[PDB]
Amino acid sequence: LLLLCGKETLIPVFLILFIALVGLVGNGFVLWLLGFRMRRNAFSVYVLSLAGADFLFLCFQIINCLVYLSNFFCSISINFPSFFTTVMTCAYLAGLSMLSTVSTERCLSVLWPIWYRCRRPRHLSAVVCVLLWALSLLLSILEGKFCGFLFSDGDSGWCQTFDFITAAWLIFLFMVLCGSSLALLVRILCGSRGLPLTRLYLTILLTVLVFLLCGLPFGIQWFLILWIWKDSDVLFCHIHPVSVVLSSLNSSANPIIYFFVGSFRKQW
Amino acid sequence: SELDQLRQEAEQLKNQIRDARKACADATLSQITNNIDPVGRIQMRTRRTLRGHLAKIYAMHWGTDSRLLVSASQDGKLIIWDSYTTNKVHAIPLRSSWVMTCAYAPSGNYVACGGLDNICSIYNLKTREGNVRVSRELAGHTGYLSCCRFLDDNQIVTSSGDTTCALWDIETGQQTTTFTGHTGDVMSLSLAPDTRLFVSGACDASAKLWDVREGMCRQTFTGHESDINAICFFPNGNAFATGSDDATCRLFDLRADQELMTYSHDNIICGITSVSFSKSGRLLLAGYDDFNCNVWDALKADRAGVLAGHDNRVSCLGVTDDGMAVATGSWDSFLKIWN
Amino acid sequence: VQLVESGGGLVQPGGSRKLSCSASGFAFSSFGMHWVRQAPEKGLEWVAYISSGSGTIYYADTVKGRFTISRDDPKNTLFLQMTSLRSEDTAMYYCVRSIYYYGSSPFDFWGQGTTLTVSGSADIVMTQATSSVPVTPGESVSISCRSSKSLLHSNGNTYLYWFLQRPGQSPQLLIYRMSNLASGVPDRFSGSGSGTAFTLTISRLEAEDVGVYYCMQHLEYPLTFGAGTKLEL
Amino acid sequence: ASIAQARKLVEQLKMEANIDRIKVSKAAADLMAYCEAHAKEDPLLTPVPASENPFR
Amino acid sequence: CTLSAEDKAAVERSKMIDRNLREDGEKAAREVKLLLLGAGESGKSTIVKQMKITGIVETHFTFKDLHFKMFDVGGQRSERKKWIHCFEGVTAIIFCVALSDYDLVLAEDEEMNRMHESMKLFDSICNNKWFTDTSIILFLNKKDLFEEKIKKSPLTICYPEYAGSNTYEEAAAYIQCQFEDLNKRKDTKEIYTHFTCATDTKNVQFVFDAVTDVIIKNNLKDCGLF
Ligand SMILES: CNCCc1ccc(OC)c(Cc2cc(CCNC)cc(Cc3cc(CCNC)ccc3OC)c2OC)c1
Ligand SMILES: CC(C)CCC[C@@H](C)[C@H]1CC[C@H]2[C@@H]3CC=C4C[C@@H](O)CC[C@]4(C)[C@H]3CC[C@]12C
Q1: How many domains does chain D have?
Q2: What's the per-residue H, E or C state across A69-90?
Q3: Dihedrals phi, psi of C173, to nearest 5 degrees
Q4: Structural domain of C146
Q5: Is A2 in the pocket of ligand 1 (CB under 6 A)?
Q6: Closest by alpha carbon to B286, among B278, B298, B277, B274?
Q7: How many folded domains does chain C comprise?
Q8: Which residues of E are annotated as a binding site for Mg(2+)?
Q9: Cβ contacts from B onto E, under 8 A
């Protein structure tokens, strides 16, 4: 999906490779630390599964970068199979659902704090993680099987109606992240007594803007904009790899913002 | 009056003691061990990490077989660990969570612990019901339990924050002997290798040597400015080291009755929580509030190494009877085995 | 510490029976449990094992598929649901408690056993070469057992267990892990060996030491006993 | 009863004065002799080879 | 997989021990732990009367889905700096002060009045290094007796710098401001102040309202925000 134009695409592929390797490094550190070394609370399950989604998405972007680079420089057309695209979209949808889950969990911890401290079930993070991963995987294999990425059978008329379903699910996840991050900010700026309000305000709208302008644009340009804009080449060779640069920036920024900034402030 | 005449008699006896012990100081230990070749850089790496505690570990004690160790933390649990395999052998839930001390019996059948409830509870490990039981509880201190140390299965020395050490008979539950003479809270305790003497350091910057049979104070050791938090006997039984809040370790000799060496550094400003010696006595390992341990060359007062693995204050350490490993426990809820 | 096995009796071949052992007087949930049977004058044969917390279950391959071992930890009761009962299942079935940590004593208490009368080359073979030693009291007697495999492990333990079955009684553990004396056992008994060759020295024999002596390995499941060595007055 | 406590302190300083002390040179030489006489049995001084080391 | 049968069963025992340790730490983590401080005769005992109805005294009460543990450490006559770090990480510190001890001089020595002693103890635990961020619920106790005693014995006995009314509310607000002025850093910790007598039955509701903010802050710390 990167050889439609070729010469115009080249500098975002170097950005995709550099950002994706440093995000693979950051997600590998988060996966190693929270998997074995550090002690996990109930929020660390969400941070771990988000770093797993980012690891799958960024290694598949490294693979689709190296296919373009092997075709461009040394001219080998590597035919890595087109069901890799389905697991890439499964990683992308599970990452954005983990961001909305984290924002909803922070809103629930401030709005119902005695329930969240005492009555919240301890396996709720693992349950909600495997359901959101299972539903993202289900939507991904269903879309890739109806659009022909899974073993080359597929009809369009259902492929666009499931691409619209994934687009509606993505704007639903954006409105869940905004509603939870707004209710948490209303309760924090109206009814607090001991909190650091500036850092909390900046961190909450920082996650909201990083979601909206880095995670979401690939999903809008992949599941919705290609059917409604009805132009296939002249905009698409520009708006596709800049969207992949934005998505790799999202999956690189997510281990820092949700693990390293929150935990490793002990170092400096 | 007459009590001022008695205090002038006490001051005359004190400067007589000081002149009779400065008559013994002919050469310092830094003059005798000048041409002793140095230890080198001790580079001990962490070999195990024991991860089960969820709060601050306040104490730890190695078993005599140099494999089992108990550790007490303030989540109300004391875990016996297999240090070779990192297994948990037992986890004993405590009746009061505010533990400050823990002890392992040299037979391995008992563990003791205590703290802010002023009771050294004693736990039977070798039960034919298969679970650990509280065998005895020893009330009688009016301050917090700060150290417990077993001599036999039936005797335990407990030091406390009511300025008092006590020797207990376990099967009756009563204090056989009371050791009085400190004027501050007794913070640490270390039995002799013959278990006929023990030293106890308190918060009055003093360390006293007690005879367990007679019940009396034999010698009194000064030199620190602040509270002695840690005390540990030399393996010969003829000296001991004290660690205190003035960022200074000091070695005191028993037959010379004074201080031989002082282990200080100008970077070191935090208090010392734990001291122990190695098997030869050549290394003095000391745990600190700057989150790491220092290995001191005990003969030359040179810093021979840093054990730098903890993210909070090293509250407790112990060297095995094998001489093989150091365990260091800490407030970051981890034990690390070093070698 | 007490274990009372219940069930058993006249069972038709092909039929079924559930054995039940109620446990009283010990912390039952921390002990792993075994069933060990004994055919009407044969030796001991290990049947099944359930872990503490029920998370690990083993069977002998003689009874695999037909027998199910299960524990109920609140009621303090161990079950052996036996289906497809053959005439080889005619035995006396013992419950054995066994706890495993560093320095524990497995197989240390055996139940009294209930009588059920119905009417594997990779296993380590423990060979007790002598079957009967006639002995007068006061003498020093050694009993030798031989193992097909080296029971010495890389951790340093050699997993060999010695049991004594007095006449009309349950077996009781004499020695665990080839040398360690069990609780409540006199220092007449002593154990030694390298890998594959083992000795149980009864020094200064009394009349209470009369019975069949069994070696047992605990290196690998299935657990296998010796044939037994009878001692007579 | 402050004269009873001071009399107890006076007899304790009397029992701590009547003691025989060796020189510091002799006690330092005995401590140095114990350390040099036991330097081979100390696995933290000498790094122990990894076959006989139980901690990997 | 180079373990024995008994080594594998010891690993299973250690994992079951780890499971029980994790579950007991989860059960202990949802409990509100409260230090109970204050000098003598400060009405700590009537507060322990109000909530539920040698060594450290533990008091348990449950109030509206929240299990509380209150630790009274007044029994231990020891140097406090050797064990005050044990209560680092306590949820709040309940500090009882008798308002009627403004004129009552201390029976230890008659140069120190009792209100200045409690002010010294509040300045000691307020500017502790282990309680830099810990919220303090300051109870100013026995306000009815203070109402009777401020009629004729003014606050210039205790605070000679004070110039104000000889009634209840001006003197009581001055005492509360004098206690709340004792933090060297007024940004990190929150001090809550409540007036108490023996007839009040909402002090546990004040304590629950004050520890809901600490629970919100710890929930935000659990959710990664700090
Ligand atoms: C000039 N020929 C070049 C060939 C060319 C052009 C564009 C293009 O990307 C869209 C692709 C790759 C591609 C990308 C997606 C991703 C978004 N939804 C999954 C989906 C499909 C399937 C698909 C698309 C359309 C209209 C798309 N309009 C551009 C119609 C039917 C259809 O299958 C039923 C794709 O087709 C392989 C290939
Ligand atoms: C049912 C299918 C779709 C789920 C499998 C998805 C795969 C790729 C993996 C990647 C990372 C994994 C998660 C990693 C962390 C944990 C924490 C653990 O305490 C519960 C399981 C849980 C939450 C895992 C669930 C499965 C998971 C999300």
Answers
A1: 1
A2: HHHHCCCCCCCCCCCHHHHHHH
A3: -70, 130
A4: 123-227
A5: no
A6: B274
A7: 2
A8: 45
A9: 87
